[PDB]
C-alpha cells in the first residue's frame, strides 16, 4: 500500500495568517493527489485534485503542487471557517490511502492547566469500584503529559485519559485523567498523587490526597 | 450541487451485517463517477473501502476483500454497503462519495455502532475535593457518569446558569459501556454556599440522576 505521510500532524495559525501544510507518499504518485477539509463536526469537502487543481467552490486561496511523492497545500489569508481539519490522499494506485491529517487550530498565548484530583465517591466504592479522577483544565498548548503515583510508585496501567476539542471561548484544551482500581486494592494505598507536566512549567504540577484522612 | 445522503441502521451487533444506503440527486450514478464509500475510525483516521463506478464495475480494498459487497439500483439513484460479521473495530462514521476531478462530493456521514450492549442507564458519583487540600480562588467540582449505553447523555449544572468553565470530557468505551465525566468551575464561596447540582440526562433509558455537591 502507499503509504501516506502528512506534516504537521497539527498548527496554531490566526486569522490573516498563511498556511503551508504537506504530504509525503512512500512512492511517486504523479500529481495523483487530491486535498480534502473536515470542518468540526461536519462532512468533508474536495479542495484539490491532480496535485494543483482547484474543485467547483473552492476560493483562490486555495492552492495546491508538487510532483513525485511530495506535494503541498496553501491556503492563504486564514478565515475562521478554514480552521478545521486537512487530508490529503493517494489515487495513483489501489487501495487509496489517506494521510493522518492536519489540524488547523487557533493561537493563542500559553496557559498552564488548573489541575483537581478527587477520591472515588463512596456509593462507587459501594459497588466495588474506586475511581480516581483529575481533571487537567484550561491549559495550553495542547501537549501534555499526565503521570499517577500509588505511594510514591508511578502507576500505568488502569489509566484513561479523555481530552476535549480546543474550547470555543478561550481556546485552550482540557483533560480528564482517570485511574480505575478495584475498591480492594484502593484501600491498600494511602497517597493518590497526579503529575502534570507541561510546557509553561519547567516543573509538574502535583496534585495528592490521602486515603486515610478526614 | 450533486447530493447524496447515507442512511441504515446506526447500531448493528458483532458478527452480523453492517448494511447501509447512499441515495444520490441532481446526478445519475449510471453516467459518470466511482461511487464510493469510505469510514472515519473513532481518532479521525480514514479508509478507503470501495466503489462500483458508473458501468457497474467494483473496487474493495484488500484489507476488507473477504467481507465486503458493494453494489447499486440504477432505478431508484442508489448504491449500497454491506459489511459481513463486524465487530467493534468496525465502529466509524460511514461516508459515501464520488470520485472524479478528486473526490468532490460527500455524503454527510452516518457513525455506525457495533455492539453487544444493551441500553443501561448510568452511575452518576459526583465530584468534590477531598478534604485536607484547602483550595485558592475557584473551586472545581464534577460528575462520573459510568456504566452507559447506548452513547447520549447531557450533563446540565444547575440550569445551565452555569457555563462559568462547563467541561464536557468525550465519552470512552470502557467494559463494554460507555464512561464520560463533566466538570464545573465556580469562585471559591459560591460553593459550598450555594447548591451546585449536576443533573445527568440519558434519554435512550428515560432516565435522569441529579446529584448535589456536598463538601468534604
Known amino acids: 500500500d502507499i503509504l501516506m505521510t502528512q506534516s504537521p500532524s497539527s498548527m496554531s495559525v490566526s486569522l490573516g495568517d498563511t498556511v503551508s501544510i504537506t504530504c509525503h507518499s512512500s512512492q511517486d504518485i504523479n500529481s495523483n493527489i487530491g486535498w480534502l477539509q473536515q470542518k468540526p463536526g461536519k462532512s468533508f469537502k474536495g479542495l484539490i485534485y491532480?496535485?494543483?487543481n482547484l474543485d467547483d467552490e473552492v476560493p483562490s486561496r486555495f492552492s495546491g503542487s508538487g510532483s513525485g511523492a511530495d506535494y503541498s497545500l496553501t491556503i492563504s489569508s486564514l478565515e475562521s471557517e478554514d480552521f478545521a481539519d486537512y487530508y490529503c490522499?493517494?489515487?495513483?494506485?489501489?487501495?487509496?490511502?489517506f494521510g493522518g491529517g492536519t489540524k488547523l487550530e487557533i493561537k493563542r498565548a500559553d496557559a498552564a492547566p488548573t489541575v483537581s484530583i478527587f477520591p472515588p465517591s463512596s456509593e462507587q466504592l459501594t459497588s466495588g469500584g474506586a475511581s480516581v479522577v483529575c481533571f487537567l483544565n484550561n491549559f495550553y498548548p495542547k501537549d501534555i503529559n499526565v503521570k499517577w503515583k500509588i505511594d510514591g510508585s508511578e502507576r500505568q496501567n488502569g489509566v484513561l485519559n479523555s481530552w476535549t476539542d480546543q474550547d470555543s471561548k478561550d481556546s485552550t484544551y482540557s483533560m480528564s485523567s482517570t485511574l480505575t482500581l478495584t475498591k480492594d486494592e484502593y484501600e491498600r494505598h494511602n497517597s493518590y498523587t497526579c503529575e502534570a507536566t507541561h510546557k509553561t512549567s519547567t516543573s509538574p504540577i502535583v496534585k495528592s490526597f490521602n486515603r486515610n484522612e478526614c | 450541487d450533486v447530493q447524496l445522503q447515507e442512511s441504515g441502521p446506526s447500531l448493528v451487533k458483532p458478527s452480523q451485517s453492517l448494511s447501509l444506503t447512499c441515495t444520490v440527486t441532481?446526478?445519475?450514478?449510471?453516467?459518470?463517477?466511482?461511487w464510493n464509500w469510505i469510514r472515519q475510525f473513532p481518532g479521525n483516521k480514514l479508509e478507503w473501502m470501495g466503489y462500483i463506478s458508473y458501468s457497474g464495475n467494483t473496487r474493495y480494498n484488500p484489507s476488507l476483500k473477504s467481507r465486503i459487497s458493494i453494489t447499486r439500483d440504477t432505478s431508484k439513484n442508489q448504491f449500497f454497503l454491506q459489511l459481513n460479521s463486524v465487530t467493534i473495530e468496525d465502529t466509524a462514521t460511514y461516508y459515501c462519495?464520488?470520485?472524479?476531478?478528486?473526490?468532490?462530493?460527500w455524503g454527510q456521514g452516518t457513525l455506525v455502532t457495533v455492539s453487544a450492549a444493551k441500553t443501561t442507564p448510568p452511575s452518576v458519583y459526583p465530584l468534590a475535593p477531598g478534604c485536607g487540600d484547602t483550595t485558592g480562588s475557584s473551586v472545581t467540582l464534577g460528575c462520573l457518569v459510568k456504566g452507559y449505553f447506548p452513547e447520549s447523555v447531557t450533563v446540565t449544572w444547575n440550569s445551565g446558569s452555569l457555563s462559568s468553565s462547563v467541561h464536557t470530557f468525550p465519552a470512552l468505551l470502557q467494559s463494554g459501556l460507555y464512561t464520560m465525566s463533566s466538570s464545573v468551575t465556580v469562585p471559591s464561596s459560591t460553593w459550598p454556599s450555594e447548591t451546585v447540582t449536576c443533573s445527568v440526562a440519558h434519554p435512550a433509558s428515560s432516565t435522569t440522576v441529579d446529584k448535589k455537591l456536598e463538601p468534604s
Open positions: 490522499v493517494q489515487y495513483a494506485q489501489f487501495p487509496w490511502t
Open positions: 462519495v464520488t470520485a472524479g476531478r478528486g473526490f468532490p462530493y
Open positions: 441532481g446526478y445519475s450514478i449510471t453516467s459518470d463517477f466511482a
Open positions: 491532480h496535485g494543483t
